[PDB]
């Protein structure tokens, strides 16, 4: 008889969607999680989705249906999912089991509504919802450890035992890549430049990604930048004008460790890592300290692993073995982890089937997915 279709893996982020086929080593499609509408001034469409909104962003106001990792606009999120299946992957959703990802601590009613929409609107034959941080841990070759997942809209510390996230110990910080971009715009403006428009924000995001780094010793780096120009870099704007950047290169991601830089009275990611571990079972803390896994685009800064190692060491018992793992593909480690999980022989049992959904309703997601 005909072989069964390969499962789809869809990782919905605040900023980027990553979608593809289970068992593949990379997503087939990566596109912005946006729906655009005419700024002012038929037109052609009442709304534009994903890469089409990106192409036409000059005439559009852009909305992000996911905020801080949480779905908050369900009508536009449905547009994103429709765009994922039919325009980016060009598959028929009723033909594929579909693995979705969710934020740590995703509210109960949100995961139910996700389940309902998948089964009733897109008519998938089966689905599963996995916590993003857990998938990143799988992609690093482990099932126990603590993940730091920092993306575009939210940052989480997630301790995980044998593949199970421990919700009582999860830490959430509403500071991530978009805030760092906004901060770089601000302090570049304080240097004499003017980055203030939405279009100019996209340029500064590229500056951030290409030139920023985490200093090992922040105050020493500031002194180095004040006493010579060895840390200064140039960047060529699209119109050919050139700007130069100095201590802004490392001041920007220093925010992750000092959220006061953007006016937040919040512990930095090193402190939240420590606090998370200290809420976990005493018997697993050593394994957490030894398996700190970085994931998400905002952990890509050069130097971030060395800095975490240094800061965690200063907080932990003096005899504790500490290891920071920063995989090279960690922009996509959530998606890769989903590809692994949905490919495991042990995963066959885990799907929620359409029949299970008809019997129990959306709340079945709370029994089967954790």
């Amino acid at each position: 008889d005909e072989d069964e279709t390969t499962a789809l893996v869809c990782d919905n982020g605040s900023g980027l969607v990553k979608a593809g086929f289970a068992g593949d080593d990379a997503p087939r499609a990566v596109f912005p999680s946006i729906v655009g509408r005419p700024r002012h001034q038929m037109g052609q469409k009442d709304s534009y989705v994903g890469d089409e909104a990106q192409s036409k962003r000059g005439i559009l106001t852009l909305k992000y249906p996911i905020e801080h990792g949480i779905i908050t606009n369900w009508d536009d999120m449905e547009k994103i999912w429709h765009h994922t299946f039919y325009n980016e992957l060009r598959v028929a959703p009723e033909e594929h089991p579909t693995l979705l990802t969710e934020a740590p601590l995703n509210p109960k009613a949100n995961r139910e509504k996700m389940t309902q929409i998948m089964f009733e609107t897109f008519n998938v034959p089966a689905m599963y919802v996995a916590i993003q941080a857990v998938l990143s841990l799988y992609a690093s070759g482990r099932t126990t450890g603590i993940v730091l997942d920092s993306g575009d809209g939210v940052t989480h510390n997630v301790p995980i035992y044998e593949g199970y996230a421990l919700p009582h110990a999860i830490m959430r910080l509403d500071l991530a890549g978009r805030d760092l971009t906004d901060y770089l715009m601000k302090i570049l403006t304080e240097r004499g430049y003017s980055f203030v428009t939405t279009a100019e924000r996209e340029i500064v995001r590229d500056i951030k990604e290409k030139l920023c780094y985490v200093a090992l010793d922040f105050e020493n780096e500031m002194a180095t930048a004040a006493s010579s120009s060895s840390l200064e870099k140039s960047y060529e704007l699209p119109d050919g004008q050139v700007i130069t950047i100095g201590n802004e290169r490392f001041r920007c991601p220093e925010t992750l460790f000092q959220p006061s830089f953007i006016g937040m009275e919040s512990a930095g990611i090193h402190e939240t890592t420590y606090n998370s571990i200290m809420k976990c079972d005493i018997d697993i803390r050593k394994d957490l300290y030894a398996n700190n896994v970085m994931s998400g685009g905002t952990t890509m800064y050069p130097g971030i692993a060395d800095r975490m190692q240094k800061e965690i060491t200063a907080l932990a018992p003096s005899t504790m073995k500490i290891k920071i793992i920063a995989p090279p593909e960690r922009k996509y480690s959530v998606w890769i982890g989903g590809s692994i999980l949905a490919s495991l022989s042990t995963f066959q049992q885990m799907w929620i089937t359409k029949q299970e959904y008809d019997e129990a309703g959306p709340s079945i997601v709370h029994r089967k997915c954790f």
């Binding site: 199970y164 009582h168 079972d281 018997d283 709370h366 029994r367 089967k368 954790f370």
Partner: protein
Amino acid sequence: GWNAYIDNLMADGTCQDAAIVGYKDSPSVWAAVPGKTFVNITPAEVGVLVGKDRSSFYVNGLTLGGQKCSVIRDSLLQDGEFSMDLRTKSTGGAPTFNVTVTKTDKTLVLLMGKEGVHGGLINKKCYEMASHLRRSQY
């Protein structure tokens, strides 16, 4: 008897242990898989499961028939959920297993999966047996 419930929970081969335990007045194992873990559950372990302190077992864990477990999710006293998910702890690389506890009006229903059996399957199984017993005043 209650052992019919144990045979029923064990029938599909997904679980290695199962038990029905009374938790009101003086707790005791009403039925359990002989020779395994849940049969040896003590009153003090039952008291921790259903007790007022819902925080210490996160850092200290808890035991079931003396088997150390780590708490993953706790909803055991919460309306409409009445379930707790755990994973055993081991030494020397030995495998660990998923456990779900559900709370009915007069019992706790416990299940332990075999190696590799996902905690979601065990939770669903335990939740359905508990719904069945609640349906009948238990």
